[PDB]
Design a protein around this nucleic acid. Structure first.
Lengths: 184, 183, 85, 185
RNA sequence: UUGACCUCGGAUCAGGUAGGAGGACCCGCUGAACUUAAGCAUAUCAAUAAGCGGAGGAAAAGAAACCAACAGGGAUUGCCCUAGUAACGGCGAGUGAAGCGGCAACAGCUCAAAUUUGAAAGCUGGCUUCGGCCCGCGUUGUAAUUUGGAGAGGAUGCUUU
RNA sequence: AAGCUCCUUCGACGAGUCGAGUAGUUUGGGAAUGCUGCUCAAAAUGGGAGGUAAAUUUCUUCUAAAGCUAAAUACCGGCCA
RNA sequence: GAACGCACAUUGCGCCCGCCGGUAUUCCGGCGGGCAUGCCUGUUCGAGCGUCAUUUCAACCAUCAAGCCCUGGGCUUGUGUUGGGGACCCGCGGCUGCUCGCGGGCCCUGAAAAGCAGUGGCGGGCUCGCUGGCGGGUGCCAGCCGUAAAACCC
């Protein structure tokens, strides 16, 4: 059974999201960030129950549906506009070397033939990818950190990470490290 | 505040509210033990005006007493019998006072406010620690409570000539032949 | 009993008393230190140091694996960092 | 068959006796209690105006002591205590009165709805003296009252007052006078 | 599902307390008969003895719902006279006070009925490095203020620790 | 923290208790002298007790139903002298 | 002995925590410390078809950014409004006109309320025709635009 205050709250959130989407669509999508491409970790948090169609399309294009899912994403103009669309549901920022290293060493899984296996062998990842230049796990570690042409296939290869629910641990540039530190 | 209203209500004991409440409570008390511990006074205005304080060391004890004669009438009051029975159950406490709470066809129910003389909250309070003195051991057995003071006729006036200072002391004083040295 | 008190404070709506009681509890996720004080038991079980080394074989094996192990509800992250350190 | 314990049987029979007798109107008015939504709104406001616990009071007093070692307005709180609240109602200082429905010596509160009606203070009967107790950091509370508030939610208090006087007082207005209970049928 | 409240219980849990003795005097409860009235039953014995319960170095009583009719007195107790008077009574046996007056000794107070409400300001325990820290009691009322020949609150100006 | 003074402000005082009827018990004491049991059951310029033929109950004097308290008093017992 | 782990007319018989001696972690004997009842305060454990609370009604725009101009003062863009009523003053669009629209100035009202709802399309949805393809109706759209056609969708 569902009460009337839930209905009016829902409608108010949907309306506020609708005006906010109209505001960002009307205004020219230029962030206060230099034109150089960067790298940001994105972890999506519980927020609004009902997702508008453009945010759910962007979240599906960024493959974030399940509970506590995280993905690294480039920073250029189009991706800046995409992450500015889905700001209230995601939290993003610059990761650290130990953050990505520990996060892939504790929770790094792979996708092939539409199924998700744990990273068990380097022979497994070499059978999965083969010939784009990656030869081990440290290879995709510094491929994620140091910029290169092999971002897209490596990001499509990796399952996104199902981090454990914390017990209490906008935009920021360095507090995300403590977040994934407590998220793991 | 509210105790003035409760005093005025307690003064109408056959009105609908008070009659209803008295009957429901009488039913419950009848099915309880003869002498049972009461968590709080059922008549807080009456207990408060008799010296009950919501402080550790103060205890209420409800007691039922069979009503009627002993045509020899018992010169002891039913309220005095109640305090004596409770005082024996709680032999470590001092009977402070007691008051009527209910009456049935065969019983009269009374609540007895008792005080623990060994609790430190009572021994440190100059308003109650007089009861810690050993001259107040079993006040209900020597006619030293309110019922005892009434039944011994301890009042001022010509109507209480033979009992105002003690009946037996007055009788011994009147029946003593005083012979002085120079007669 | 202190778990009963912190549950009472949570059910009573007192956030500050809940914070005080969880500070007093020393619950081993915000600290990383062991929940209980185990000085006397390990004193009575190990009277000298070479027995401590003999069990430190397995102890250090457990800890190195645990430092390379991830974190869940029963095994939080802070004492995993303490394992690493 | 099996035998029930004595005090459980006393509890259930006291239930049946208090619900199936011809109850006088002053006691039968206490069976009509606020709904869930209005109690939730009232407790939102009263949770905004809770008193301070012992720890916060000593902490604040230590703060003033060290500030003196090295300006305020009147505090606004929920007023509690039976004699204090009765004195507030009689002097027409209280604005809203919430009376618990399960005071075991019910004489302590039977005159309270009539008193609030006479002096003109809006009142409502709430479910649970333990609920009012949690609000004032005590085990129980027979009655609570709100007299005056900070500016930023005065309007809200006014609406709440109007709410009870439109949502509880007129639904009680005809049944507050009638005897309750009975086994007719 | 979880957590309060209330009520009723358990524990070889912690800290305490009661019982018995003594009982000359004291406070209560209960309670006779012989005897006198030259018989005897009302009465007397006697509100005594026996019996039961409860204290102390004293107990009890005690600061007027008193005495009085005054030009008034002024908590209680006891001594002297009042006084074998008043009063009551098979008006027989008899029973039998008190006010005033003189003296000994003198002492007055605490609560309930109030909203601290600009702040439960109060208290029992446990831990202690003994200095201050926790749990609990308590708003169905613990401190302060007040106790009706009073009192409160403001103002006011002296006088007190 | 405390006493006093002043006043265009206030001033809450004890209920199965008084009392009425009735049965015992007790007293010099049917205003029942007091107490107790049963039935009924109060008041608020109120209530209690007295004074008075005096012209109507005029007047007088106190506040019950909560509590503490030394001394003067008793004493075949206790520690002694 | 009030007499107190049970009995008591026996120097007998049990429970909990420890020790010593004699073949001794197993057997025996002895020893040390505890174990009565009523009640008060606290502690802990437990019951109750006694009893209440448990589906955010919160915050979240820029608390300043970006670009100009003469680097010292400003300028520009950042589109963000509860609903009614009135015994008034206008302006501008329309209508053959009354009048109706859009925008102002003056008041009143609790976050107040008792029919009056009408302006044209594009897409998607539903429906019914023809042999996935072709056509129209719609008090459907928590989808866009303003009549000219898109955007969005896949």
């Amino acid at each position: 059974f569902k009460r009337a205050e839930k209905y009016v709250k829902e409608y108010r959130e949907q309306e506020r999201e609708k005006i906010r989407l109209a505001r960002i669509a009307k205004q020219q999508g230029s962030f206060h960030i230099p034109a150089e491409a960067k790298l940001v970790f994105v972890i999506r948090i519980k927020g609004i129950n009902k997702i508008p169609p453009k945010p759910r399309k962007i979240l599906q294009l960024l493959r974030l549906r399940q509970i506590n899912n995280g993905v690294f994403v480039k920073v250029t103009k189009a991706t800046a506009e995409m992450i500015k669309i889905v700001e209230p549901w995601v939290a993003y920022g610059y990761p650290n070397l130990k953050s990505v290293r520990e996060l892939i060493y504790k929770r790094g899984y792979g996708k092939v033939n539409g199924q998700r296996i744990p990273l068990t062998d380097n022979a497994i990842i070499e059978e999965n990818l083969g010939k784009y230049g990656i030869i081990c796990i440290e290879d995709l570690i510094h491929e994620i950190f140091t910029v290169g042409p092999n971002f897209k296939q490596a990001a499509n290869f990796l399952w996104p990470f199902k981090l454990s629910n914390p017990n209490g641990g906008g935009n920021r540039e360095e507090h995300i490290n403590a977040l994934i530190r407590a998220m793991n | 505040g509210a105790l003035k209203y409760l005093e005025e209500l307690s003064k109408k004991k056959q009105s609908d509210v008070v009659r209803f409440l008295l009957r429901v409570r009488c039913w419950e008390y009848r099915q309880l033990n003869v002498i049972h511990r009461a968590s709080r006074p059922s008549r807080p205005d009456k207990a408060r005006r008799l010296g009950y304080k919501a402080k550790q060391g103060y205890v209420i004890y409800r007691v039922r007493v069979r009503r009627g004669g002993r045509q020899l009438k018992y010169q002891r009051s039913l309220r005095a019998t109640a305090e004596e029975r409770v005082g024996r159950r709680c032999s470590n406490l001092r009977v402070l006072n007691s008051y009527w709470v209910n009456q049935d066809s065969t019983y009269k129910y009374y609540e007895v406010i008792l005080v623990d003389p060994n609790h430190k909250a009572i021994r440190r309070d100059p308003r109650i620690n007089w009861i810690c003195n050993p001259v107040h051991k079993h006040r209900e057995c020597r006619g030293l409570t309110s019922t005892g003071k009434k039944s011994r006729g301890l009042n001022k006036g010509h109507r209480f000539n033979k009992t105002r200072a003690g009946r037996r002391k007055t009788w011994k004083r009147h029946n003593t032949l005083s012979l002085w040295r120079y007669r | 009993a202190l778990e009963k008190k912190i549950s009472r404070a949570l059910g009573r709506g007192d956030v500050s008393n809940a914070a005080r009681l969880e500070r007093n509890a020393n619950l081993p996720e915000k600290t990383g230190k062991p929940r209980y004080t185990l000085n006397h038991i390990i004193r009575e079980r190990y009277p000298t140091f070479q027995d401590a080394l003999r069990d430190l074989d397995d102890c250090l094996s457990m800890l190195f694996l645990f430092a390379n192990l991830p974190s869940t509800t029963a095994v939080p992250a802070k004492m995993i960092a303490r394992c690493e350190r | 068959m099996v035998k029930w314990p004595e005090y459980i049987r006393l509890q259930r029979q006291k239930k049946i006796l208090r619900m199936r007798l011809k109850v006088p109107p002053a006691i039968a008015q206490f069976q009509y209690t606020l709904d869930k939504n209005l109690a939730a709104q009232a407790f939102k406001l009263l949770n905004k105006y809770r008193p301070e616990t012992k720890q916060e009071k000593k902490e604040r007093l230590l703060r003033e002591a060290t500030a003196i070692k090295e300006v305020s307005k009147k505090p606004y709180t929920v007023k509690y205590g039976l004699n204090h609240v009765v004195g507030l109602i009689e002097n027409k200082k209280a604005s809203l009165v919430l009376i618990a429905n399960d005071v075991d010596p019910i004489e302590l509160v039977v005159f309270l709805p009539a008193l609030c009606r006479k002096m003109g203070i809006p009142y409502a009967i709430i479910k649970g003296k333990a609920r009012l107790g949690t609000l004032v950091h005590k085990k129980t509370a027979a009655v609570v009252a709100i007299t005056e508030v900070r500016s930023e939610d005065k309007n809200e208090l006014a609406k709440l007052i109007s709410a009870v006087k439109e949502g509880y007082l007129e639904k009680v207005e005809d049944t507050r006078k009638r005897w309750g209970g009975g086994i007719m049928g």
